[PDB]
Amino acid sequence: APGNYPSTRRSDHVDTYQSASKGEVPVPDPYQWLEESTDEVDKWTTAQADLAQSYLDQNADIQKLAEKFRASRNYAKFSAPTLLDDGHWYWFYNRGLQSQSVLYRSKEPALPDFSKGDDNVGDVFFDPNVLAADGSAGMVLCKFSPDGKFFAYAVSHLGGDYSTIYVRSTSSPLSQASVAQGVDGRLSDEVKWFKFSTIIWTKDSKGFLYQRYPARSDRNAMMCYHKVGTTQEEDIIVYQDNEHPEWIYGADTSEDGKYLYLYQFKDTSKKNLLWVAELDGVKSGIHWRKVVNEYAADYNIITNHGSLVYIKTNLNAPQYKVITIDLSKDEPEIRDFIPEEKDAKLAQVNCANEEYFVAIYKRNVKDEIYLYSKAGVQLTRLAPDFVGAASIANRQKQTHFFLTLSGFNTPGTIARYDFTAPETQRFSILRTTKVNELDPDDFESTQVWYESKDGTKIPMFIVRHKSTKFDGTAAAIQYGYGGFATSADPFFSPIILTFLQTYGAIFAVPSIRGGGEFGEEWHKGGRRETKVNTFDDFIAAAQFLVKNKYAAPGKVAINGASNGGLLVMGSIVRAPEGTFGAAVPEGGVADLLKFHKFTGGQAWISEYGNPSIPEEFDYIYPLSPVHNVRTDKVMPATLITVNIGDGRVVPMHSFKFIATLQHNVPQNPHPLLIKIDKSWTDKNVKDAADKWGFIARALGLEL
């Protein structure tokens, strides 16, 4: 229980604020000088950093944990494959070295066995890392032509604002081999000024649509059409609007060849227009049937059968739905095809094997996968016990589709559904993620519900190694963010899973208010004047973990970053003594009275309120971690983290908070320390090892 923290000078600096209830309020701010960039601050930072490192050096498990994190750090990433009209399969593969994934082509015209290795079953077709010799050019976006003969790709060099589209034949690889042989085998096509749209081929495979601006703010966008094997001078303007210079455009083409769709956007909401047109291919002076005119709702087209168009929309349905619009009638006949679900956001719909719809719902922060008929009958749920995120990849005419699945236990699993197979054998696993010292199958993701202070029911994710028991024994790592409508969705971290497996601990992720887990009302429920709910939900989660025997008492550690740092710091201030065993806030806000007076501060006003406004000060001040540190409560072992390289949140917040703790509870039984991140395999797990090792020791966990 040492008192040996370095002395922090206390100045006579007093800030004055205005309270709606109390009037003028003088607030002493003796660590105000830590706001400034001076030698005094730099020397105080070194003294604190050195203390922190001295404590970490008495923990020999830090270096042991580092090697385990080094082991599980690297792994390959991949996409689901696509079968093109040339009979070959194409897919992205990243071996885990370079920042850009490489596009592979199957050697044989057949679905590869992906347990053999990507280089054994595939050849490199497009390696974007060699666009520029130094790796300074990136592929932003790409698209194959419907006939499989050509490949369009948008390239962005690090300097430029815009990007440039290029075309190459699918028989012309770009690789380390190919560039060594001589000149790049692309076509001469160089489509400049491309920005903020997809690339959309016509179904004739003759050309593609793309958004472009004039040459050099961004104004007067043009949805254009580029013929393959031509210069940009040969291009057509499909649409522009002189009268609304800020407007942005999207396009789409129907598989049958009949329709060209124009989307129009005016702002950062999801509302959009939808005009429809009939084709021969794409030419100029298009007569647009203006179906969705006026900005009402989100409308994204799924597919069509003749004049019947299927559309995902949120018109009078916040959780989305599917409608049909029949265009053979003179007036379009709008009908509900798949109705809104009250408690399930319709996320994605794809037509599959012509007479079916594959479909993704998010319900209780989890994706569910459904198979529907062309008449809208729900035929079955696929992968019912899956806990995570799912997306669909397919082409409408083919007799299969894929699912890309991810969660806490894996960053990637490709599933295949084969309509031609026997009923019991339609669903299969194409491939899984390989990580040293970690099998995805050893980790179970569940969801439990607890009651917060005001009676609100919050779901919470629990992850464990399968040998760990819910018998009041395990340590728990409780992660949160708690703001900005940013959901704590399932995410993959080898560092965490290795930690759960090493110590028999559990990972706990509560869907606390302030996040986006149940839409804008959920955010609204933990924002500005309701912000205290965010903290009460987080605190009630930790109490629930112990009460219901998920974790042992005194063994729930908390961690979060940026807004999560404020969450952690505010929570150890507010929560009853002994609620938490350890605490690691990373780069967090902590002075909630001054946050808006520093770089990036103003953007947080919509989340916490404005301290300069008297009525808002009154609900802000009682939350401010820097102004609510008591003398008479034992704080849990606390390692505060800041990345001095990371501009985001000024380190001032953490400096003030640690100085305040060390002053208010100098004889605190557990160490209260601040660490400066060494990093702004070998050198990449150093900060994580210090962090997770501090927690393990603080919770009394042995290797």
Residue numbers in the entry: 7 to 222, 230 to 293, 296 to 695, 704 to 726
Please share text taken word for word from the publication where this structure appeared:
GmPOPB is the macrocyclase responsible for macrocyclization of amatoxins, eight amino-acid ribosomal peptides with the core sequence IWGIGC(N/D)P. Amatoxins are cyclic peptides further modified by a characteristic sulfoxide cross-link between tryptophan and a cysteine, and hydroxylation (the extent of which vary). GmPOPB is an unusual enzyme catalyzing, depending on substrate length, proteolysis, or macrocyclization using the same catalytic machinery. The protein contains two domains as observed in other POP enzymes. The domain containing the putative catalytic residues (Ser577, Asp661, His698) comprises residues 1–81 and 450–728, and the other domain is a seven bladed β-propeller, comprising residues 82–449.
The apo protein crystals belong to space group P212121, with one monomer in the asymmetric unit. In the apo structure, the two domains are in an “open” conformation, in an arrangement reminiscent of a hinged lid on a bottle. This open conformation has been observed in other POPs in crystal form when free of ligand. The catalytic serine sits at the tip of a loop and points toward the β-propeller domain. The side chain oxygen of Ser577 is 5.6 Å from the side chain carboxylate of Asp661; His698 is on a loop that is disordered. Ser577 and Asp661 of GmPOPB occupy the same position as Ser554 and Asp641 in the porcine proline oligopeptidase structure. Comparison to the apo structure reveals that binding of substrate induces no significant changes in the core of the propeller domain (rmsd of 0.75 Å over 360 Cα positions for the S577A structures). The changes that occur (relative to the apo structure) are in loops around the catalytic site.
